[PDB]
Amino acid sequence: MLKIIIPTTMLLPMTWMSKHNMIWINATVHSLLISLISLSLLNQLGENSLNFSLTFFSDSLSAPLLVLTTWLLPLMLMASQSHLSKETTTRKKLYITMLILLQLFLIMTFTATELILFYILFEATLVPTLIIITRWGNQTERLNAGLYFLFYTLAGSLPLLVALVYIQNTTGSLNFLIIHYWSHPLSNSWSNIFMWLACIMAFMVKMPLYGLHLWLPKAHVEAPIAGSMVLAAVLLKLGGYGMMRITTILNPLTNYMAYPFLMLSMWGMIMTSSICLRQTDLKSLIAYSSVSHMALVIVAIMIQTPWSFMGATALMIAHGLTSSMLFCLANTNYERVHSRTMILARGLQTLLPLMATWWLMASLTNLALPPSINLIGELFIITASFSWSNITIILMGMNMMITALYSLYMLITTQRGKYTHHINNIKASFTRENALMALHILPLLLLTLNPKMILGPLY
Amino acid sequence: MNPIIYTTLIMTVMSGTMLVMISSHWLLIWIGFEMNLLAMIPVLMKNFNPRATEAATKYFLTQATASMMLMMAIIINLLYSGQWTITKMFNPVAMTMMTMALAMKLGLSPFHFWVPEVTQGISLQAGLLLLTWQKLAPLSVLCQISQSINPNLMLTMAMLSILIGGWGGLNQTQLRKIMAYSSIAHMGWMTAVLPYNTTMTILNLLIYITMTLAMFMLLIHSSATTTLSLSHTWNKMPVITSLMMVTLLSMGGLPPLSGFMPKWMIIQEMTKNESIIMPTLMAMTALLNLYFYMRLAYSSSLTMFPSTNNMKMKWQFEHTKQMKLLPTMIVLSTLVLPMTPALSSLN
Amino acid sequence: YGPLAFVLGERTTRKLTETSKVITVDGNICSGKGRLAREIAEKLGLRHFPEAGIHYADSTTGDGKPLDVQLSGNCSLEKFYDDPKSNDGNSYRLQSWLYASRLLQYADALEHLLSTGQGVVLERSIYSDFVFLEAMYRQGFIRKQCVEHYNEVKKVTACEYLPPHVVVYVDVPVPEIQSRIQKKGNPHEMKITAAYLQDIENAYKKTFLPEMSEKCEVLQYSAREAEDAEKVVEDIEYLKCDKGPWPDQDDRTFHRLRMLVQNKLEVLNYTTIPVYLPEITIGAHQSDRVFQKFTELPGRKYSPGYNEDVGDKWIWLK
Amino acid sequence: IRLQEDPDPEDENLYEKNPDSHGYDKDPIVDLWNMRVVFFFGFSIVLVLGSTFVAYLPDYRMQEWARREAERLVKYREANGLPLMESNCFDPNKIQLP
């Protein structure tokens, strides 16, 4: 795995020692090359994971996530170039180093073989994210949002740390391979119930769960564009990966313990999409959409069936790409008009047609138009839920309808109608912005052709 | 105070602690504590203020009561065993009295009330000596008598110390008081593992000492005793406030910073002894410490508070005095986590 | 100098001689105090510090040349003369910056006296700066809160330093001072009101002179008498102020003072007290921009001796 | 309440100074080279080449191998009259029931 890790580390000295003019260029070139290197990991043996060394291993679950992270860094750099132009060279380098440290921590999380190392780096990801939000946010609420995000995640994680140490003391190892191979069943006891809660709750906080999702809207609305990109694309999927890995230990008790979280997610997706129908802030709308999709993923994980897991992985990747692109599209309009209110900017299709096309494609993927990987994941989750219970289809279909409604409603309000007369600062979309939207879209449409890459290990 | 006299007083403090950590006879250990107090009191009053005198008086009264209780416990253990050696204590009442005395010396709650006041009264340098060096001797004594310690009393004091250290800090806008409450919480963390594994207490003490040394030296370099005076620092020495933010994050215990390893190892040892509820509560209660650390960071570095026009004058000048060990202390306080397995050296 | 130097046996008392004598020549605007101060310094062989101005620090740091007003001072005395009651708060900014400059000058002066044993002749001082503030407050140029902030800063800072041994006040009547200002011909200075000068004189005579007379003796001279510099020098040489702080001070107090004055930042530590007065509070964006501009100044990016731009060499081994 | 600089006007459009801005920076040269770097190393290199690399990635998933083994087993079991798929994953004899 060091083929990816060490160049990522070397990105930091290169960024620090590069000339003030060339920081973005050098970062982008080498991050794209690192992603090209990371593309090799997609080749996974069907029976067994790629165990590179004692510390690091990769499977068909970790590889798409690593590729997503490595692809996401250059996109974040392109998006964050514009609003950081006025910043001094040291501050821009510090921002880039926070991004690089975040990518490094995420790669090591997805590849770590030991649950305690996974926890250490998965909690380490908070520090760069918190610094980004609280230092380069543009509103006074960034401090409150950072506090909420940090404290929600830590309150979830600390019991996970205690439980992981207890597992190390009892079973004797936290290596995922050994745990999977030994994996003695749990018993229905209050001690085991609370171990299950401790293991599950940290990831349930990371994957915005209804009632634990309050941090996500504040964080995504208040963060800068790059921070929103990582939060939507990878930081939420950290919870999904953790839950999928950790579900091996808690085999039987999952059936009893899933019902609260299952019902919470199943109702919360409807509630959050209904919230999306009435949101007045574009970033907030996208955030609640992310909450709904992640609730679907939570349902898929809790069901613990092969089709559910495949759909969960597909939805994770597809949603990461779609949400990152949607945040980028919203950020462009925010830079142009300096407000996030949906109603303020109207009829932008006449002013910016290619951006309107990007918005159309992004919304179509968001509403899971086939054969998008979004729909592949969602449909697999729906079929798994139907096997779990035929009555799930009512809630799943209602959620799909509302997702279509709010996606096309955002598209209609922002990009259709009469142009706002008084706004005169709209200017032709830069090649950077269109390039960013294309870099988001083209991989997503391409992955439809070969879907086995993002269908996970159980494929 | 003449610098030769100041050096003699500091060497007397250090010699008292060395006698505490070196002697196998209880009378000499108590003598070392007495020397520590005698030498410490004028050091706390190097700069003569009414607050300095008040802090010295409070500290003297508290340490004098602690020493008297300690000597009574020693005398009772002598009465029931006839042994002067620091070893298993053969009378439970003497054990309880000695535990209370040593906790009062350490500032463990509910004997914590003097720590914030004394720290606020004395200067930043005296505060550094008080919150780093003075902790060594009582912790050494407790480690030597760990087996005799009744786990319930020590654990209750540790949990109360963590709770009170977390609570008090939230309400404080004075940097010295914040540091004192953080010290109380970390002392609770250290004394939590004392019944189980003393090496963990030593490791936590070393990490805490490095972090507090770094924080106090940064405060001295910035010459700030209040949150706003520290907020003004970004305009003058941005590197200082950036390093302060990193050290604060370490003190909160956030991974992958070095502040995480003492909490991690303490939780490990407690779980090995089937303690699950206690580590969970301690870890959750650390979030209050983390909160006021984060608020200080917001005030200092992450957010740019308004400066004053006269700061343009200070821009031209440079800091005259250099604290040599500050960079290494920062590095150890922040980036030593990849090197925990070396916790077998002090073992 | 350091604790080590004191341990090595460096004693300030031994170095201090009769020459050591902080002499402050004070007076109203255009009172001729500079001429007499210069003459006294020449005749008595004492260092002469010109009256502290907006860019006193600029002279004592770096190249020495004055910096831009935005970078250093952010205040204009000409603006004060033209627009005393400006909403910009330039009046109190100017007064506070002048007080800080005089604090730095007094520290530098004391450092010279302790390091060399040579007396220092100062044109006004921190102890006399309150006169201008009182005059502004009486005329309504500054608010009461500005006066309270100035009092806080003075109370915290000035107590540390030792007051001058000899105070020389050159007294010139206010109408003759107005005549002198007209003769000098400075356009901004001409706008000074008579009431402002009268309040300066009132503050001086009513407060500064008695308060200094309590500590030591004050030599008050008229304009004609001040012109006879040799007579003033003789009077100073025949002064005997046994009462006062300087006889009480010993080597310990001198060591503490020597240390304080050496650390200029420690001297100016409380001039930046976090009291958020509108006049002197600088917003975050403006503060950041001005700090960046100061950093971009030649020879200011790094610590002195490490700025390659201004010709420093051997940095890799320095 | 404070002396603060006036809020800067909306950041000057890069189009004004250089009409062919491309964005990515103020100076046109770095603009052009940043866009060339982005376009080349993303679209030309990563997207195209990596898409081919994934498309022709070796079937280490053993899909074709699984199909060939299934074909052999089906042919053999149909030829010998054995049932196509045995109901027991593991041989009953090796298992020792309680």
């Binding site: - | 957010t303 | - | 309440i1 809020p7």
Partner: peptide, 14 residues
């Protein structure tokens, strides 16, 4: 516009 920074009121709050 520009990133919000603490004003006199916010600073005085602490």
């Amino acid at each position: 516009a520009r990133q919000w920074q603490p004003d006199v009121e916010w600073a005085e709050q602490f």
